[PDB]
Design an enzyme around this catalytic site. Sequence first.
Site, mmCIF file in Angstrom:
data_model
loop_
_atom_site.group_PDB
_atom_site.id
_atom_site.type_symbol
_atom_site.label_atom_id
_atom_site.label_comp_id
_atom_site.label_asym_id
_atom_site.label_seq_id
_atom_site.Cartn_x
_atom_site.Cartn_y
_atom_site.Cartn_z
ATOM 1 N N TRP B 83 0.833 -1.287 0.006
ATOM 2 C CA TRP B 83 -0.178 -0.030 0.009
ATOM 3 C C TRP B 83 0.899 1.283 0.066
ATOM 4 O O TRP B 83 0.307 2.513 -0.167
ATOM 5 C CB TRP B 83 -1.085 0.044 1.105
ATOM 6 C CG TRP B 83 -1.672 -1.271 1.344
ATOM 7 C CD1 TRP B 83 -1.494 -2.259 2.230
ATOM 8 C CD2 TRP B 83 -2.803 -1.793 0.479
ATOM 9 N NE1 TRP B 83 -2.305 -3.242 2.153
ATOM 10 C CE2 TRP B 83 -3.288 -2.919 0.951
ATOM 11 C CE3 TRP B 83 -3.336 -1.482 -0.506
ATOM 12 C CZ2 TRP B 83 -4.352 -3.724 0.483
ATOM 13 C CZ3 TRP B 83 -4.275 -1.967 -1.121
ATOM 14 C CH2 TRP B 83 -4.738 -3.052 -0.625
ATOM 15 N N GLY B 119 -7.764 6.324 3.252
ATOM 16 C CA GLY B 119 -8.108 7.145 4.277
ATOM 17 C C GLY B 119 -8.150 8.927 3.783
ATOM 18 O O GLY B 119 -8.069 9.461 4.829
ATOM 19 N N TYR B 130 -3.457 -2.439 -8.129
ATOM 20 C CA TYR B 130 -4.220 -1.781 -8.935
ATOM 21 C C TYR B 130 -3.969 -2.006 -10.677
ATOM 22 O O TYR B 130 -4.667 -1.218 -11.406
ATOM 23 C CB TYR B 130 -4.470 -0.271 -8.735
ATOM 24 C CG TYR B 130 -4.883 0.067 -7.524
ATOM 25 C CD1 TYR B 130 -5.532 -0.822 -6.383
ATOM 26 C CD2 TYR B 130 -4.349 1.073 -6.539
ATOM 27 C CE1 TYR B 130 -5.744 -0.580 -5.097
ATOM 28 C CE2 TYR B 130 -4.665 1.535 -5.195
ATOM 29 C CZ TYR B 130 -5.269 0.549 -4.632
ATOM 30 O OH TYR B 130 -5.574 0.905 -3.236
ATOM 31 N N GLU B 199 -12.479 1.278 -3.331
ATOM 32 C CA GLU B 199 -12.292 0.847 -2.306
ATOM 33 C C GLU B 199 -12.161 1.681 -0.973
ATOM 34 O O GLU B 199 -11.434 2.699 -1.043
ATOM 35 C CB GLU B 199 -11.167 -0.243 -2.172
ATOM 36 C CG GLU B 199 -11.530 -1.585 -1.426
ATOM 37 C CD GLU B 199 -10.650 -1.592 -0.093
ATOM 38 O OE1 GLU B 199 -9.698 -0.736 0.231
ATOM 39 O OE2 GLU B 199 -10.691 -2.433 0.754
ATOM 40 N N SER B 200 -12.709 1.499 0.068
ATOM 41 C CA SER B 200 -12.493 2.294 1.154
ATOM 42 C C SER B 200 -12.847 3.598 0.964
ATOM 43 O O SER B 200 -13.929 4.230 0.552
ATOM 44 C CB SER B 200 -11.133 2.258 1.747
ATOM 45 O OG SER B 200 -11.043 2.941 3.022
ATOM 46 N N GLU B 326 -13.619 -6.842 8.463
ATOM 47 C CA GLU B 326 -13.085 -5.486 8.052
ATOM 48 C C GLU B 326 -12.463 -4.765 9.160
ATOM 49 O O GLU B 326 -11.393 -3.873 8.947
ATOM 50 C CB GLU B 326 -14.450 -4.592 7.850
ATOM 51 C CG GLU B 326 -15.051 -4.912 6.749
ATOM 52 C CD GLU B 326 -14.377 -4.290 5.543
ATOM 53 O OE1 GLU B 326 -13.527 -3.456 5.554
ATOM 54 O OE2 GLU B 326 -14.618 -5.085 4.575
ATOM 55 N N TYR B 329 -7.763 -5.607 10.588
ATOM 56 C CA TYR B 329 -6.462 -4.986 9.902
ATOM 57 C C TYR B 329 -6.109 -3.578 10.942
ATOM 58 O O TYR B 329 -5.023 -3.432 11.167
ATOM 59 C CB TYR B 329 -6.664 -4.360 8.527
ATOM 60 C CG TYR B 329 -5.688 -3.439 7.876
ATOM 61 C CD1 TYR B 329 -4.792 -4.068 7.480
ATOM 62 C CD2 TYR B 329 -5.577 -1.933 7.821
ATOM 63 C CE1 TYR B 329 -3.378 -3.541 6.634
ATOM 64 C CE2 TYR B 329 -4.378 -1.596 7.437
ATOM 65 C CZ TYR B 329 -3.514 -2.104 6.668
ATOM 66 O OH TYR B 329 -2.371 -1.566 6.079
ATOM 67 N N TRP B 431 -0.621 -11.494 6.449
ATOM 68 C CA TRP B 431 -0.910 -11.111 7.680
ATOM 69 C C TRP B 431 -1.373 -12.360 8.591
ATOM 70 O O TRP B 431 -1.682 -13.388 8.073
ATOM 71 C CB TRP B 431 -2.330 -10.452 7.612
ATOM 72 C CG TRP B 431 -1.867 -8.859 7.161
ATOM 73 C CD1 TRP B 431 -2.308 -8.616 5.812
ATOM 74 C CD2 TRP B 431 -1.439 -7.875 7.789
ATOM 75 N NE1 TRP B 431 -1.761 -7.003 6.004
ATOM 76 C CE2 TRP B 431 -1.253 -6.832 6.789
ATOM 77 C CE3 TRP B 431 -1.231 -7.572 9.200
ATOM 78 C CZ2 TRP B 431 -0.845 -5.361 7.103
ATOM 79 C CZ3 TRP B 431 -0.610 -6.359 9.545
ATOM 80 C CH2 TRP B 431 -0.487 -5.510 8.506
ATOM 81 N N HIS B 439 -9.225 -6.065 5.689
ATOM 82 C CA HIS B 439 -9.637 -4.937 4.897
ATOM 83 C C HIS B 439 -8.405 -4.965 3.699
ATOM 84 O O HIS B 439 -7.252 -4.924 3.987
ATOM 85 C CB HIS B 439 -9.487 -3.958 5.727
ATOM 86 C CG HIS B 439 -9.870 -2.471 4.907
ATOM 87 N ND1 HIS B 439 -11.277 -2.141 4.872
ATOM 88 C CD2 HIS B 439 -9.408 -1.624 4.194
ATOM 89 C CE1 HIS B 439 -11.510 -1.168 3.939
ATOM 90 N NE2 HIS B 439 -10.614 -0.709 3.655
#
Lengths: 533, 530
Positions: B83, B119, B130, B199-200, B326, B329, B431, B439
């Site tokens: 990310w 966020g 992506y 997303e998000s 969800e 994370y 993870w 998430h």
Amino acid sequence: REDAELLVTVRGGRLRGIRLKTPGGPVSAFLGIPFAEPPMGPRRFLPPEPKQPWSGVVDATTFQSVCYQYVDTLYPGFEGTEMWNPNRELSEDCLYLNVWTPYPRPTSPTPVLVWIYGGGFYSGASSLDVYDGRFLVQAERTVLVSMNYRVGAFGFLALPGSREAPGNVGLLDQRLALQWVQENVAAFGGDPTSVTLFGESAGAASVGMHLLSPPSRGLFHRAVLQSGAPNGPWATVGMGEARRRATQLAHLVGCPPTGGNDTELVACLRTRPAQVLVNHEWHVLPQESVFRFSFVPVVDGDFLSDTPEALINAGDFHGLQVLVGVVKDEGSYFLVYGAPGFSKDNESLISRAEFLAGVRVGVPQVSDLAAEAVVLHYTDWLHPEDPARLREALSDVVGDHNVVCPVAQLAGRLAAQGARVYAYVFEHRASTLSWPLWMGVPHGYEIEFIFGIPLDPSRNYTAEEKIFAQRLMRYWANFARTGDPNEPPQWPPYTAGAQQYVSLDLRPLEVRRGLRAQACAFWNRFLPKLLSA
Amino acid sequence: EDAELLVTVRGGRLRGIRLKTPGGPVSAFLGIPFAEPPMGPRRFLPPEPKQPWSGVVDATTFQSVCYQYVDTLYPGFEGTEMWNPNRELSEDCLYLNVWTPYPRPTSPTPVLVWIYGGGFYSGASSLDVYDGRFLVQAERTVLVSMNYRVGAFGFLALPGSREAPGNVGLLDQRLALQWVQENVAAFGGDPTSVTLFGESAGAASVGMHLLSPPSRGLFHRAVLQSGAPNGPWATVGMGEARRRATQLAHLVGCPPNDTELVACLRTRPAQVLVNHEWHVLPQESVFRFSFVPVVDGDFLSDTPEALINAGDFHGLQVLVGVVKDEGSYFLVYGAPGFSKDNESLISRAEFLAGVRVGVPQVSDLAAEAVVLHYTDWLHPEDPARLREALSDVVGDHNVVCPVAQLAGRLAAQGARVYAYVFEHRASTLSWPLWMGVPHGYEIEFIFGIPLDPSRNYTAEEKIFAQRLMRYWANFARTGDPNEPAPQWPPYTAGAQQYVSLDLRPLEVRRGLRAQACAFWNRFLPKLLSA
Ligand SMILES: *[C@@H]1O[C@H](CO[C@@H]2O[C@@H](C)[C@@H](O)[C@@H](O)[C@@H]2O)[C@@H](O[C@@H]2O[C@H](CO)[C@@H](O)[C@H](O)[C@H]2NC(C)=O)[C@H](O)[C@H]1NC(C)=O
Ligand SMILES: *[C@@H]1O[C@H](CO[C@@H]2O[C@@H](C)[C@@H](O)[C@@H](O)[C@@H]2O)[C@@H](O[C@@H]2O[C@H](CO)[C@@H](O)[C@H](O)[C@H]2NC(C)=O)[C@H](O)[C@H]1NC(C)=O
Ligand SMILES: *[C@@H]1O[C@H](CO)[C@@H](O)[C@H](O)[C@H]1NC(C)=O
Ligand SMILES: *[C@@H]1O[C@H](CO)[C@@H](O)[C@H](O)[C@H]1NC(C)=O
Ligand SMILES: *[C@@H]1O[C@H](CO)[C@@H](O)[C@H](O)[C@H]1NC(C)=O
């Protein structure tokens, strides 16, 4: 001439009783023993006075009058409601108690069971057929005592602070009887050092108030609370609300001709016929509701120095054994008394709007916010409008709010603070029950099995229901003797962590956990904080 | 040179690159500028359309990532590095990317527009996860993705000022949507069939574009994955936005007059504002971000919850969904007792402390209500149940129940809604096992990354990915994920039907955590009002 087993001298004088036949043999019964002066005329609303001694022999040979009270009229002639209605003439001359003892009288001191009836503090009497103590005494060799106490306005109308209507006089009727048991039960063969209180509904709430009141606490050693608790939202009222209801009752019957002066207002109240008072008793309630009663014990700092919840929390209960429990469907019986859409004569499958309206009736005098917290909690949001789920949900609302959760909190606090606690859920629906099937095991229908009423041969309980009755009579008497209902499948104590109780049905004992722990967390932990903000 | 990789758009000429996929080639045009660089005096201002250029712009590699915080929590750990920015930071970052079949379509082709999450403080259109080449090849669509300013650069607001109006990262998005209407046909795309998906925070952005009329006319369908514009973290009021903008100025040495304040802020290097971004939040929390869309009456004429309740949504199809876990994370970013390295078996005291971090800025009575609903009072101190419960608290409050409320309101007011729960844990997931399907880990399958042979997805996971790409492209083409086989029924306010997405055929279920979401969506708003 005369039978010596049926003659007994108590402090007040000499008594004569009767030899009662039971299926299993004879018992001695002393019915209608006067324990107080008649609370009539100028003694109405006043605390009871001990019975003055008498010369000669008092014939204690039948049940005495039922204390004046409202008489149910919802289903006239229906056995399900008529079994709770008075079976003796109404009178204010009603302060009498009953002693059942084995025949011949015991030679060594025998443990005593003292029964306190329910009836929402507005009704009840020790003479109902379902309270017949002859089977318990015969089957388990105990002394059984039961008393009458004043109800409705006569027992619990309070003008707090005054001396002509101090309130709680119904509770002091019970306390006076408990004092009578201490001084006199040995004359019948009972052990005044082993006295177990037990009661149901308002009677169970009364038993709790005796635990939380030091002058009463020294008059017994063990307690049994069936389907009731003193911390229930119905069992007490505040001084200000007590005064408002009393003043409003007075105003409705023409007296004073209007709080004015306390003695002048009570003095006019004493000139009204008892029936007149009874006919206006229900009009004083602040709101439309089920499970709310006009005149109940008042938290006035005397009998109860604080609210029962405060004393339950601040209480040291070491050395105390208690037995508590509920029936399986505590709330169903009350919905046919005012919840919209409910009747015993149909299935009572209500709509969503009737559910939301029933919530305001079953949980009265709370904010809209509190009401929506209840709806949230009791709604199944995958089936929000299912009528059968809605009927069950509203039954659980009034049952959890008024009985199950107040008792669960009492059980948890006592266990965590020094008491040995045993808990049950009564899940057998009697084969003779006249109520409809959707009501499950309704409120108050475990009592007949505890008193052994199925052993009456003139009643059509099945044979297995008679072995069941004999089973529970042993549990209760074992508890009265030893503080443990187990005999020397086990019944474990209730503790705040494990929260173990037993089911009482025709099957053997079965141990489960949590007395509706999720629901009672809402009523006992969260919603108090909501009302405080 | 190849004519397939030369495109003329309104601003000038472009040269693309031919990419390889296991199914054949696709053409890609990366780093296309759609705005004037928002540098210097243009910092904090709405984007300006890119002026026309002469010559041929190089559109063969991704361009700069917008200035953002870089996560440093587990350095080198793939689960967080995937990310992180994978190109140099710059304020000169307003570029978009177009992927298309090779050779370019001759018939108008449906367009997918991807808005990344992060966020509103991070994210980039260049992340490996992506990569549009697999969707474009497998399902023959046109795929577009754009960068938009994040952090203070995109959402710092002094409401009322012309210097720092607010929501300019949303305006970057809308300008790219406008760019698509005017130029996507030069690539073979059909500007009358544009499906937004994100997303998000990308999903929150999509929802915002639904609720903003100048945005609503630039697309036709929407997909919201694990996000919603009515999320407690997704918008801020005018007063709190000005307070956070003022606290940022003070932290960077700028006198906290609106013109002077932004002028001072303009003189500061971009990295300086990034460094102080997290320190203007009112409380320690997981799941809260300093600079988010502001409700100022312009882009959003009212709060997203208000406009959802009042909206006519006939003629709209939306696809919405969540992953199974969800909340897990986010717990390793501030919840006491948690770590991707422990089993994170917390105590009741840590659970109670975590409630106030995962549900920040609520009264004590509101916190007690949360504790009531999420405690099992027969096992109130079981550490495995507590870890699971506070995962549910964070997930329900921030993702699941905002999504559920938007789905229920849109369905009941005219929209056809399809709902999913993504329940497959990737075999390659780094993870720990206790976090379930965390998430963000449905994106790799929707973009068809399992088909990359350079990675170790199972054969089954490759087929799964192809089924998901088919669902998403069916929805883009027709507004229905089902093949024109187990059927996917619409979500309705009453039946509340959704499907599970995993290696097993579709299973229809009922209720997106209906019991928990009645608490967050129905009861608790009332508790805050009294
Ligand atoms: C409230 O009034 C009582 C009752 O007073 C008597 O009855 C009334 C109908 C009226 O006619 C009064 O005048 C009567 O005296 C008061 O109680 C009496 O108070 C006096 C004064 O101390 C005393 O001598 C009497 O014995 C009391 N009678 C009782 C106690 O039965 C009382 O004082 C009044 N309360 C107040 C003013 O607070
Ligand atoms: C189920 O019964 C309730 C109670 O109604 C009473 O008992 C019935 C058997 C019948 O004899 C009614 O006439 C009695 O009133 C019903 O609720 C009542 O509905 C009527 C209108 O039909 C209304 O006027 C009353 O006020 C209602 N009573 C209460 C307490 O709400 C209910 O509709 C019945 N359901 C059926 C028949 O399907
Ligand atoms: C049980 O038996 C009698 C005998 O016929 C029956 O009529 C009635 O239902 C029951 N009797 C009583 C007293 O309830
Ligand atoms: C704010 O700065 C502007 C910009 O030049 C200036 O005109 C003004 O004097 C300052 N603020 C006031 C007058 O409140
Ligand atoms: C799995 O693929 C990864 C690339 O993500 C590679 O690093 C690794 O070597 C592969 N698996 C094994 C067992 O080596």
